[PDB]
Amino acid sequence: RPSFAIARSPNEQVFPAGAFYESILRWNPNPV
Amino acid sequence: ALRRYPSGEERCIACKLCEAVCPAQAITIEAEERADGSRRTTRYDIDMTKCIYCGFCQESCPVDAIVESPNAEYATETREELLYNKEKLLANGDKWEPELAAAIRADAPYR
Amino acid sequence: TVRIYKPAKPATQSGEKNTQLWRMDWDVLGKGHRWENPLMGWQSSADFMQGTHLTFKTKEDAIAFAEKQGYEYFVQEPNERHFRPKAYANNFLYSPGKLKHIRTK
Amino acid sequence: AEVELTIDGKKVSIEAGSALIQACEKAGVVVPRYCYHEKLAIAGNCRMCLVEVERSPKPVASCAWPVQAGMVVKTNSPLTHKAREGVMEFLLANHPLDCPICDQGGECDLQDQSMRYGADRGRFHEIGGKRAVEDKNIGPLIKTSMNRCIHCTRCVRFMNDIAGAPELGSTGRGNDLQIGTYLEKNLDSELSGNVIDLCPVGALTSKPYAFR
Amino acid sequence: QQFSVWKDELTIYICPTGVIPVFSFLKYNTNAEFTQVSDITAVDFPTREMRFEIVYNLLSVRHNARIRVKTYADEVTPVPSITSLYMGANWYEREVYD
Amino acid sequence: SDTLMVHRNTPENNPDIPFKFTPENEKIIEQILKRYPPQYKKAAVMPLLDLGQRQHGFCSISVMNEVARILEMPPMRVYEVASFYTMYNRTPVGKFHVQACTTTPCQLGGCGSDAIVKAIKEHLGINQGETTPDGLFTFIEVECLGACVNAPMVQINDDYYEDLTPETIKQVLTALKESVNDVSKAPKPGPQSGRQSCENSAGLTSLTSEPWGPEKTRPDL
Amino acid sequence: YNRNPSPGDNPPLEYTDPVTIPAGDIADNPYWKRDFRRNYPRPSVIAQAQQVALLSVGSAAQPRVELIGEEGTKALVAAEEEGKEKGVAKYLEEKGAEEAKRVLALTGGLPPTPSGQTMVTGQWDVHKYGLAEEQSYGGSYPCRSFV
Amino acid sequence: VRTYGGLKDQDRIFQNLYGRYPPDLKHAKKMGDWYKTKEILLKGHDWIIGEIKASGLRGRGGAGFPSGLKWSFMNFKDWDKDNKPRYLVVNADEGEPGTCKDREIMRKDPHKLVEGCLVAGRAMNATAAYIYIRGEFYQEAAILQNAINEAYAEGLIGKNACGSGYDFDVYIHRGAGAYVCGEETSLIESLEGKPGKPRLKPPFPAAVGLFGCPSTVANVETVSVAPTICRRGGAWFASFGRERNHGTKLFCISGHVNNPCTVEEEMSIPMRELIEKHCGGVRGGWDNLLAVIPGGSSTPILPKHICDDQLMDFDALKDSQSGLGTAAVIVMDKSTDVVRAISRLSHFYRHESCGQCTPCREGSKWTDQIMKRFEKGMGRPREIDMLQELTKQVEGHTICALGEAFAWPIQGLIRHFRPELEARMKKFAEETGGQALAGGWTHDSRQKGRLVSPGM
Ligand SMILES: Cc1cc2nc3c(=O)[nH]c(=O)nc-3n(C[C@H](O)[C@H](O)[C@H](O)COP(=O)(O)O)c2cc1C
Ligand code: SF4
Ligand code: SF4
Ligand code: SF4
Ligand code: SF4
Ligand code: SF4
Ligand code: FES
Ligand code: FES
């Protein structure tokens, strides 16, 4: 009966990915 | 006699405990799944000319399915009349049920 | 003919109690072992040895008894397990290559 | 390199790296078990095979413990008696009263080792009752009665490691951990009916054999 | 050959030839007045070469004691009858033979 | 509560609905797989289930099937992981996941954790387990969340609102409710009632002096 | 008064199935402590070889010689292989009449007597049948009351 | 002769407990972190193990195993004659009710944990450190990884750790909601992509661990102090607390105290002194204290008559049949139901059992049901002895120590609050009309046609 949070479109992000997952794209094991 | 639940379902679930304990090998049982998938017997015979009337089946039954009635006045003209199949035993339970429940009611505390 | 054998362990249990002794058993004949009684559907027999078996501590004992009575006999030797050591730590071996199987405890 | 050890005061020799339960079988010592099978990977989850090992404070799982150069093993001490009785009590607390209707009856290792190694009476009388679990469809050959399950893991280990059919598993956690396929599907192995025999309990039984 | 004690039962194991001397001693010795044969019977052990175990149970009313004597026999190896020492033994041996 | 340990085939939950990770989400996965031995790719199942949950809303059997395909694990091995860990919502949830710690420390500490549930159960008018008809608040009790000195406390999506009072939790749900329209109205994370993180509410009894650094060290390097 | 009420009208709720609390406790009764079936006595078997050893070197309750550690372990096994080779008769014949007196010395000089089968007096013994102080027939009939 | 407790700020370790600085490296370098990391690396790995041995440092995750010995297991006979990687696994799981210290380290001063993995890794010759953070700690994982990226950017960790020629990687792995995954083998199996069911040991992680490789699992706190241990000295650490209980301890105080907080203090401190001069005392005064759980719910409860003169370390808390655990102090005033507070803990463990072994998967559910009945007095007093022996056949019979984690709290309540359990059984009998049967059924069950067996 109640509406939920499911991605209506295939390219929809239901939940914000998060601060921790942004520090992974920023991760780089080589010194600058 | 073979007994029912108050709903009328058979009490017997084909455990074969009475067939195994029987000191005289008087009981023969066959069983499969019923049409509704219930564990039930297809053959339940007691050879009354093999039975020693010891009550071991009634003691071994976990559901009170097989019992001995108080009846003793059933002498027959032919020996074939003493080969009870499932039909004969379920009819006996239907006729004698109020005695069967009363006897179980009185002695179950001691069983 | 009688069969002389060590009964195999049932596939349904781990207890080995009934594999300790040697069994002597009569082979079932082509005719007369069982038939359906027309009256009750019971299973009649003409084989007076059908429900008889003998137990022996050793097979030389079973063979000695069978030779003495004059039974024809056939000795079936028992299949024995092939030993292989087992280790719990083998569930967690390091795989240098493609995993080849994913274990689930 | 067969090492030499003592089990119940009698000496036995066996290859190094062998499990203690394998030495007990070689020595002729009977050790109760549910999870352990000679043809499967060691699990160590049932706790039935716990024995007393010298210089070891906790009782030890004889199926998982490696044999050493000089260990002394006591399988009939009070500690072993107490372990088997307690483990059998936990196995039977949630076990369903189904032996009249169960097809394992008369060939059941839970019944035989309860008679041999457990107590004669139970102490679980909870008003809250027992765990009950829904049944699973895993094809036409295997009838399931999952309340009887004791979580030995034998069917998962066989289906995965031996049969190469990784569709059987276990889902959930705790007392609610449940064996099955998470989504109802036929088990595609021509070796599937071996789980019926491997199952110590009548949780996985033969559908064509049912009740006969 | 040997004796065994289980709880309060003493069993004596003897070779068949000594059946008469041994039971004479158990009947007539002043410290063994087993003057009644309670029972004679047999047990079959096919795994044994002497398949038949013959078991005698005796009673000493004077000493309020019982003793068991075991010997062995075969299909073709007889045993001495103890009918000359005990009249009651007559039918028990016929039963063992039957 | 009533969490099933088997799959239930529903129009929102069956292998027929396809799940694909977005091209944005794939970049996350590529970095994730780098931090494990390549032949132990299956060690990334827990990270990848989390991303499928965040993209799709819940851990559907389709997310489970795509995670298995990416790591070449048999799907049952993924079903076992997803059903063993409680953070994977294998049933759809609402917009906000109210999670109130009711283990003993939060029961005792500060105001009753019984009162936080009492406040929550009257703010949304739904018992433990269910979601609001608007589909903004699924509410369930959870086990110790690691904020016991700040008891009682609650988690919603990734935040620990702590040091709670039945009025404070009440106004947090409103602030979260109004936040679906204006982002700036979202409540601040952390504990309420003035306390910063875990110090004494009646003044610091420690770390009052200036901290010491590298000025003191063993002379032998 | 007689069979009134009929046993079929005995109220079922009154009768209580009794349980003895050691055997029936829920707290302090481990099964293995009351498992008297598995603690059954094995039969104690003595062959001719064992009695010769028991005569040569005595018993654990009463040894014949010191048998202290080394040179006694080999001495003890000598008494075993001798018992196996020569039976009781040959052993006694070599040792002579003194050994025969030693066998009876085990039983206190006289040969032993068979054990009794009643323990009413506290020891195994014969039952001491004696005439009852009250003769039911008196003396008018040929039957006597033994107590 | 000397009283332990009340160490000064200059002698603390976690100088950022109360969030006075941002978690950036600028402030971390100001605090001595990452100061002489190069020189410590160039020193032999025996030197680091000796320093951790000398300090008397014991594992801070609950077990109290001396860290220096523990980390030495990894440097077996021929560790250098193999090509397998070698793993440091930081246990940042924190599911034990009461403890909050581990979250503070990860969010207040991340660079102590990062510089610990580096230091602790070289002591046991590890190629990579894996930090397993509980999945509900989403924010703390973000702050920890930000520090990790910044440590990666400075050359501080990675291919050439601080220019010492030591390859080392530090990674973050998040959990997904399981208290069992704080167990050492459960953590290892969770890291490999499996449900967190503990492994049996003999296979010892030092030999066979993560991915089948040599691995050591260490609590967050016991890692975060190793660098400042070396920078200040083992002798300096082996000066606080009694002879075998050395150093400083992070105490998380919660429950019925006026100001629950998280403070660093000294091993072997009087328990009363810790609560009174760091948390405002007990609600209603020290005379109002009913009982406390000293080291987290897995430790047995301690009553007032022992809490009066109790020292906070391993040996003393063991002497009073309790344990230091994770130093998670949960205190109850006189206005509590102590049985209900422990029934909740039994319900915690019934939800956290992995379900692999028989005594725990079935025993945790069984003890939980009895605990619910003991809340309402719905049983006979002989069942109290029955519950005590149920805990005993759980104890020492399980694959992992979660089995003791739920057996001990019940034993502590039976040991110290049996009259309270007896009392409500009396109350419930005074209402129903008689003592209840075993299992919670009323005295009159047989009268009402219920199924009742003899001996119940
Ligand atoms: C059920 C259970 C849960 C545990 N949870 C944790 C935990 O959350 N954190 C932790 O550091 N240790 C935990 N431990 C203890 C670990 O197994 C291990 O002792 C510790 O993580 C590392 O040892 P150390 O304290 O010497 O560093 C737990 C143990 C058990 C049995
Ligand atoms: S009568 Fe009773 S004992 Fe016999 S098969 Fe039916 S249920 Fe089993
Ligand atoms: S009463 Fe008759 S049928 Fe029943 S067990 Fe006895 S002999 Fe068998
Ligand atoms: S599995 Fe064994 S114990 Fe359980 S119901 Fe079937 S036969 Fe009885
Ligand atoms: S279903 Fe049977 S084989 Fe599978 S885990 Fe349960 S008891 Fe073991
Ligand atoms: S004790 Fe509990 S958590 Fe540990 S292995 Fe056994 S069932 Fe799993
Ligand atoms: S057989 Fe060893 S634990 Fe199951
Ligand atoms: S008990 Fe609620 S946060 Fe730890």
Side-chain angles (χ1 to χ4, degrees), chain A residues 2-32, chain B, chain C, chain D, chain E, chain F residues 1-166 168-180 183-220, chain G residues 1-73 75-147, chain H residues 2-456:
Chain A
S3 162
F4 287 104
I6 299 90
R8 290 145 326 201
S9 150
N11 286 279
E12 196 203 331
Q13 189 69 207
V14 172
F15 274 111
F20 167 76
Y21 282 145
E22 294 294 329
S23 47
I24 311 309
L25 327 167
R26 288 196 245 127
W27 178 59
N28 193 252
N30 324 308
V32 295
Chain B
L2 278 174
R3 294 181 62 233
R4 293 171 200 266
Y5 284 113
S7 84
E9 177 59 83
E10 280 165 53
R11 275 182 180 263
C12 187
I13 41 88
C15 72
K16 299 165 153 138
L17 267 51
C18 56
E19 191 182 43
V21 80
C22 185
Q25 307 230 319
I27 308 171
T28 317
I29 305 163
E30 293 173 60
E32 73 242 47
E33 325 179 77
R34 205 168 54 187
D36 66 342
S38 170
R39 189 185 168 123
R40 301 298 159 177
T41 51
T42 301
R43 158 205 308 288
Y44 194 107
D45 321 311
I46 302 175
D47 189 337
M48 309 300 272
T49 80
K50 283 191 196 64
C51 174
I52 64 146
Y53 303 83
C54 59
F56 291 14
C57 31
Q58 144 184 274
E59 301 167 46
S60 58
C61 196
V63 291
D64 301 23
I66 192 61
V67 307
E68 284 198 61
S69 76
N71 186 29
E73 285 120 346
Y74 57 109
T76 67
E77 184 217 76
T78 58
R79 186 137 101 72
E80 292 95 343
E81 295 163 66
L82 299 160
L83 300 173
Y84 286 9
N85 68 13
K86 194 182 161 176
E87 318 292 334
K88 176 69 163 126
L89 279 148
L90 262 180
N92 269 354
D94 296 344
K95 148 159 163 189
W96 289 99
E97 175 50 37
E99 298 232 18
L100 304 181
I104 283 149
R105 173 225 268 144
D107 203 48
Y110 303 90
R111 298 176 178 183
Chain C
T1 291
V2 301
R3 186 73 67 111
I4 291 177
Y5 62 111
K6 279 268 201 110
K9 183 192 59 82
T12 47
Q13 279 191 282
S14 292
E16 306 191 321
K17 173 65 196 308
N18 297 334
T19 73
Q20 290 156 206
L21 293 170
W22 286 85
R23 198 170 157 107
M24 179 177 291
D25 255 338
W26 276 260
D27 305 297
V28 348
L29 298 179
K31 302 302 151 127
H33 184 250
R34 284 299 192 285
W35 65 91
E36 192 135 31
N37 169 254
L39 174 55
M40 278 333 261
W42 291 341
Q43 299 210 19
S44 329
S45 207
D47 179 10
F48 51 69
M49 289 325 282
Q50 63 84 24
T52 318
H53 79 269
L54 302 164
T55 290
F56 292 90
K57 290 178 183 180
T58 67
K59 71 165 197 220
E60 323 297 3
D61 287 349
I63 293 159
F65 190 83
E67 290 288 11
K68 178 165 39 53
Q69 312 303 132
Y71 312 150
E72 286 150 322
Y73 67 87
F74 180 91
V75 173
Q76 180 198 285
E77 303 289 355
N79 314 329
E80 294 255 330
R81 261 170 208 283
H82 298 44
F83 176 71
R84 182 166 217 270
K86 298 171 82 63
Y88 176 64
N90 300 146
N91 300 332
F92 322 101
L93 252 72
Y94 177 59
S95 200
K98 193 179 123 165
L99 270 196
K100 168 148 66 179
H101 158 246
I102 295 186
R103 176 171 286 289
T104 166
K105 227 74 188 60
Chain D
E2 289 193 314
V3 307
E4 193 298 302
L5 74 145
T6 282
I7 299 156
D8 303 335
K10 53 184 166 323
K11 309 270 262 283
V12 67
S13 202
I14 203 169
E15 198 75 17
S18 302
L20 183 52
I21 200 168
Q22 299 179 281
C24 292
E25 271 138 355
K26 190 159 178 218
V29 172
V30 186
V31 173
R33 80 283 312 272
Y34 292 104
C35 63
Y36 179 78
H37 191 276
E38 190 97 272
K39 296 307 207 318
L40 306 171
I42 293 144
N45 67 51
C46 83
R47 318 301 294 170
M48 204 46 194
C49 77
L50 304 172
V51 294
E52 214 168 25
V53 170
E54 244 167 27
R55 298 198 277 99
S56 167
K58 196 156 293 190
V60 332
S62 64
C63 62
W65 203 257
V67 172
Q68 285 332 314
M71 66 180 50
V72 170
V73 176
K74 285 173 187 67
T75 64
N76 222 58
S77 46
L79 186 105
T80 311
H81 295 325
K82 197 206 163 263
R84 294 160 176 177
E85 267 178 46
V87 174
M88 274 297 330
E89 178 159 19
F90 291 131
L91 271 182
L92 291 197
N94 288 308
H95 200 81
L97 273 68
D98 280 7
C99 301
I101 69 191
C102 191
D103 274 332
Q104 202 79 37
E107 66 178 42
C108 191
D109 277 345
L110 183 66
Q111 285 189 326
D112 281 358
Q113 304 177 101
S114 153
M115 186 56 100
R116 189 49 180 86
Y117 300 105
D120 73 315
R121 60 201 67 212
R123 288 188 317 186
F124 180 95
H125 308 294
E126 290 309 296
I127 43 182
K130 291 175 192 264
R131 155 193 71 206
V133 145
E134 75 182 271
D135 266 325
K136 332 274 209 269
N137 287 286
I138 54 169
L141 287 179
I142 307 174
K143 176 191 244 73
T144 81
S145 184
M146 303 310 290
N147 284 347
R148 292 146 196 192
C149 179
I150 66 167
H151 315 84
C152 69
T153 300
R154 285 178 176 178
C155 47
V156 170
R157 276 176 285 143
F158 174 88
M159 270 315 252
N160 203 45
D161 318 335
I162 300 300
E167 286 56 61
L168 202 58
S170 54
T171 52
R173 204 167 85 198
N175 208 248
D176 291 284
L177 165 82
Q178 279 164 81
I179 271 68
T181 77
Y182 179 67
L183 151 68
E184 301 224 304
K185 58 184 48 220
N186 207 328
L187 287 183
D188 49 0
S189 173
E190 71 311 312
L191 287 180
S192 79
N194 291 286
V195 299
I196 300 158
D197 273 274
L198 278 165
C199 199
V201 295
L204 301 176
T205 60
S206 163
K207 171 69 188 206
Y209 193 56
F211 315 145
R212 288 173 60 225
Chain E
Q1 299 162 129
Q2 57 169 57
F3 70 90
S4 63
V5 182
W6 172 54
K7 276 175 170 200
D8 42 316
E9 308 188 10
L10 167 60
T11 302
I12 287 283
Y13 303 78
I14 66 152
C15 55
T17 36
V19 157
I20 298 285
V22 163
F23 280 95
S24 302
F25 183 98
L26 296 166
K27 187 172 167 203
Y28 295 124
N29 182 283
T30 309
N31 277 87
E33 202 180 317
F34 297 94
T35 51
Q36 177 160 101
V37 171
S38 318
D39 183 78
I40 309 180
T41 195
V43 192
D44 183 29
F45 301 88
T47 204
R48 284 175 195 172
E49 180 175 17
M50 300 279 122
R51 72 184 284 190
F52 299 130
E53 174 175 277
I54 317 288
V55 183
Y56 307 76
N57 269 99
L58 303 179
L59 171 60
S60 177
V61 165
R62 180 137 297 138
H63 299 310
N64 182 31
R66 297 186 183 269
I67 197 149
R68 187 159 323 141
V69 182
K70 280 164 161 191
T71 194
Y72 47 80
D74 208 38
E75 279 111 325
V76 292
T77 314
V79 177
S81 170
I82 65 176
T83 26
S84 52
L85 295 162
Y86 296 100
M87 294 167 308
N90 196 307
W91 275 26
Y92 286 115
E93 279 174 15
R94 287 179 63 194
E95 212 194 289
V96 168
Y97 166 76
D98 200 355
Chain F
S1 42
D2 59 342
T3 296
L4 266 56
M5 291 330 323
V6 305
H7 174 72
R8 287 297 190 241
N9 213 263
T10 88
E12 311 302 85
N13 209 26
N14 41 88
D16 288 344
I17 319 86
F19 179 83
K20 180 131 80 52
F21 279 114
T22 71
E24 244 179 311
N25 251 331
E26 282 188 352
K27 194 164 304 302
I28 317 197
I29 284 178
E30 184 107 353
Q31 296 282 147
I32 288 306
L33 288 163
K34 282 225 287 266
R35 290 192 338 280
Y36 305 103
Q39 77 279 30
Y40 293 110
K41 258 196 319 296
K42 69 181 193 84
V45 58
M46 287 182 80
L48 262 68
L49 285 181
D50 199 356
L51 274 305
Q53 180 143 266
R54 293 164 178 273
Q55 201 191 293
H56 184 82
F58 79 108
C59 204
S60 104
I61 190 140
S62 297
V63 165
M64 278 178 235
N65 280 332
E66 179 59 349
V67 164
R69 179 194 83 47
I70 282 151
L71 304 169
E72 320 110 337
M73 338 176 55
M76 189 54 195
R77 297 291 86 68
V78 176
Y79 305 152
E80 294 182 303
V81 171
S83 63
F84 180 90
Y85 294 94
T86 49
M87 292 196 39
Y88 297 123
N89 294 101
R90 291 153 40 238
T91 278
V93 288
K95 190 154 304 282
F96 296 104
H97 205 14
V98 192
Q99 279 147 94
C101 180
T102 65
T103 289
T104 305
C106 276
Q107 186 174 192
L108 295 184
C111 261
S113 93
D114 287 58
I116 295 310
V117 201
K118 190 148 194 268
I120 294 172
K121 272 206 258 142
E122 97 187 341
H123 198 328
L124 305 310
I126 35 165
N127 317 286
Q128 306 87 309
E130 50 217 318
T131 179
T132 73
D134 317 334
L136 287 43
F137 297 98
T138 318
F139 164 54
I140 50 98
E141 316 189 44
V142 292
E143 233 59 59
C144 180
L145 278 185
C148 314
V149 305
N150 295 45
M153 52 83 54
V154 136
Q155 171 159 63
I156 301 286
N157 293 303
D158 296 306
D159 295 288
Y160 281 16
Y161 316 86
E162 309 164 355
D163 268 38
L164 290 170
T165 317
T168 325
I169 186 78
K170 195 158 315 200
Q171 95 187 47
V172 158
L173 313 188
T174 63
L176 286 173
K177 185 181 193 109
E178 310 172 341
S179 87
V180 316
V183 54
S184 89
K185 312 291 306 272
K188 69 178 324 204
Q192 266 92 344
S193 295
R195 203 153 80 146
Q196 273 285 324
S197 92
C198 72
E199 77 274 322
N200 202 306
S201 78
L204 265 74
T205 73
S206 184
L207 315 188
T208 58
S209 310
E210 288 315 309
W212 54 265
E215 70 268 3
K216 78 159 68 71
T217 309
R218 51 180 320 136
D220 48 274
Chain G
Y1 297 164
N2 196 48
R3 223 176 156 281
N4 185 323
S6 145
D9 276 21
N10 282 340
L13 272 285
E14 307 236 23
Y15 175 83
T16 62
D17 200 7
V19 130
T20 279
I21 74 92
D25 222 292
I26 57 153
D28 206 13
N29 45 326
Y31 183 78
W32 57 279
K33 301 221 155 153
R34 64 178 170 96
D35 187 346
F36 295 118
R37 187 180 48 130
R38 305 213 195 100
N39 292 63
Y40 67 94
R42 307 163 62 70
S44 184
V45 183
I46 305 279
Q48 285 229 12
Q50 254 275 348
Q51 213 213 315
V52 175
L54 282 157
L55 297 168
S56 149
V57 295
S59 58
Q62 189 45 73
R64 270 269 271 185
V65 284
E66 280 321 282
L67 299 122
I68 304 180
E70 201 183 351
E71 191 224 59
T73 295
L76 186 74
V77 86
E80 307 251 41
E81 101 176 358
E82 175 202 299
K84 182 163 36 77
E85 143 169 57
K86 43 189 92 167
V88 182
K90 272 189 219 94
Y91 171 85
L92 250 52
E93 177 243 21
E94 317 285 55
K95 261 35 174 179
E98 292 298 86
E99 239 293 342
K101 273 280 134 177
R102 282 219 72 237
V103 161
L104 280 193
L106 284 171
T107 57
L110 298 124
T113 206
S115 296
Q117 303 222 317
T118 174
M119 224 205 318
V120 280
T121 74
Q123 308 170 350
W124 302 101
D125 195 9
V126 306
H127 178 80
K128 257 80 136 152
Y129 292 91
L131 291 161
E133 68 167 292
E134 184 295 298
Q135 293 295 314
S136 60
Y137 290 106
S140 44
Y141 298 91
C143 185
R144 293 194 298 172
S145 317
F146 280 81
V147 75
Chain H
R2 50 176 292 217
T3 172
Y4 308 86
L7 63 101
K8 296 103 61 181
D9 292 295
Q10 60 121 350
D11 276 359
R12 297 243 146 76
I13 279 195
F14 303 97
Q15 291 163 97
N16 217 44
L17 205 40
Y18 305 135
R20 71 134 44 81
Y21 284 154
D24 313 345
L25 191 59
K26 177 189 181 62
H27 302 68
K29 265 150 165 306
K30 177 139 41 169
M31 272 150 111
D33 306 311
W34 296 112
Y35 172 51
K36 276 307 203 336
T37 321
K38 184 225 208 210
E39 321 296 329
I40 295 175
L41 287 193
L42 276 312
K43 295 264 216 193
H45 78 100
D46 297 17
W47 182 87
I48 324 161
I49 296 279
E51 283 300 79
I52 306 279
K53 281 200 236 196
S55 34
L57 176 78
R58 283 166 85 160
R60 298 276 177 281
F65 201 113
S67 270
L69 241 193
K70 183 157 140 150
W71 302 355
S72 93
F73 286 37
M74 191 132 168
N75 304 305
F76 43 81
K77 187 63 190 306
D78 285 338
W79 67 267
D80 44 346
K81 319 244 290 177
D82 213 350
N83 38 17
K84 258 171 280 160
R86 289 163 66 89
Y87 293 122
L88 188 162
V89 201
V90 168
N91 201 340
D93 211 84
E94 209 202 22
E96 182 74 40
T99 163
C100 291
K101 53 151 186 113
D102 287 82
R103 88 178 283 206
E104 316 295 25
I105 295 178
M106 288 191 312
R107 67 174 158 168
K108 284 334 199 284
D109 44 291
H111 289 278
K112 274 199 191 346
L113 216 175
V114 178
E115 206 214 299
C117 303
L118 198 275
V119 168
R122 158 73 187 177
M124 50 199 152
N125 295 300
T127 88
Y130 275 104
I131 304 171
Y132 187 104
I133 285 136
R134 71 174 298 174
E136 305 90 353
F137 280 1
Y138 200 54
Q139 291 311 356
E140 301 86 336
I143 315 133
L144 185 44
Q145 174 69 12
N146 295 322
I148 285 183
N149 305 316
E150 236 194 83
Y152 261 110
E154 270 262 338
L156 264 195
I157 63 148
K159 282 284 126 183
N160 201 349
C162 324
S164 94
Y166 197 92
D167 295 292
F168 201 64
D169 272 345
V170 194
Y171 304 120
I172 294 305
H173 181 92
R174 296 185 49 243
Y179 160 71
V180 74
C181 294
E183 196 276 334
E184 153 181 30
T185 53
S186 160
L187 201 180
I188 286 184
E189 290 272 280
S190 175
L191 252 198
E192 310 191 347
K194 327 157 170 290
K197 298 174 158 260
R199 301 170 178 180
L200 287 72
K201 315 146 67 175
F204 288 123
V208 195
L210 177 62
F211 309 132
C213 299
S215 309
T216 296
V217 187
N219 171 261
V220 158
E221 188 188 317
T222 206
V223 179
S224 296
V225 316
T228 165
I229 283 269
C230 302
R231 266 193 311 265
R232 306 171 60 107
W236 159 91
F237 203 67
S239 99
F240 313 109
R242 298 193 298 161
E243 207 86 295
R244 249 177 289 300
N245 304 246
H246 280 335
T248 79
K249 192 40 193 129
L250 288 170
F251 288 94
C252 300
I253 319 275
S254 77
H256 279 168
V257 289
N258 310 107
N259 301 279
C261 83
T262 296
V263 67
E264 216 187 302
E265 248 304 327
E266 177 182 10
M267 314 282 312
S268 323
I269 185 181
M271 139 180 174
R272 167 176 198 159
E273 160 144 351
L274 174 84
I275 270 176
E276 73 175 14
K277 297 172 60 62
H278 274 321
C279 284
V282 182
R283 256 161 56 180
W286 178 263
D287 276 73
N288 184 37
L289 184 74
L290 179 58
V292 315
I293 299 122
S297 65
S298 296
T299 82
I301 194 137
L302 279 187
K304 184 188 181 304
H305 64 86
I306 301 185
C307 286
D308 271 345
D309 191 14
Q310 177 61 39
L311 310 190
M312 305 306 314
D313 50 15
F314 304 99
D315 297 86
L317 275 169
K318 176 157 308 141
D319 268 359
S320 51
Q321 309 182 304
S322 211
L324 181 55
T326 89
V329 194
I330 313 125
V331 348
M332 275 141 267
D333 63 51
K334 281 220 192 90
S335 80
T336 82
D337 181 5
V338 70
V339 178
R340 173 196 193 174
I342 308 294
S343 274
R344 197 45 188 81
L345 297 182
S346 301
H347 188 88
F348 162 83
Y349 287 113
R350 146 162 191 187
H351 265 76
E352 297 317 310
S353 164
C354 78
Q356 198 183 191
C357 72
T358 298
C360 161
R361 159 185 82 249
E362 309 302 320
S364 43
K365 191 248 199 185
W366 195 357
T367 41
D368 181 57
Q369 279 169 312
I370 299 164
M371 284 321 279
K372 295 326 154 263
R373 295 165 48 225
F374 279 16
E375 273 169 2
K376 316 207 269 192
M378 278 177 21
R380 43 190 191 92
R382 199 54 175 166
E383 291 197 288
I384 292 166
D385 312 80
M386 202 227 62
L387 174 48
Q388 161 68 26
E389 284 178 37
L390 278 192
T391 67
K392 275 311 185 89
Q393 53 200 39
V394 162
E395 224 185 337
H397 289 77
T398 69
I399 299 169
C400 75
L402 190 147
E404 283 105 357
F406 90 79
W408 286 336
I410 297 168
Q411 277 152 350
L413 170 92
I414 289 173
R415 211 202 331 270
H416 284 294
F417 298 84
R418 200 198 167 117
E420 155 43 7
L421 292 166
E422 304 250 38
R424 325 202 260 245
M425 296 177 171
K426 182 149 289 323
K427 190 171 156 223
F428 170 83
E430 263 178 22
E431 292 171 20
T432 43
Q435 180 155 296
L437 315 181
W441 309 86
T442 57
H443 70 97
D444 53 293
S445 284
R446 169 168 194 243
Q447 195 275 48
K448 274 86 181 63
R450 272 176 256 191
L451 175 58
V452 175
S453 71
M456 168 198 312

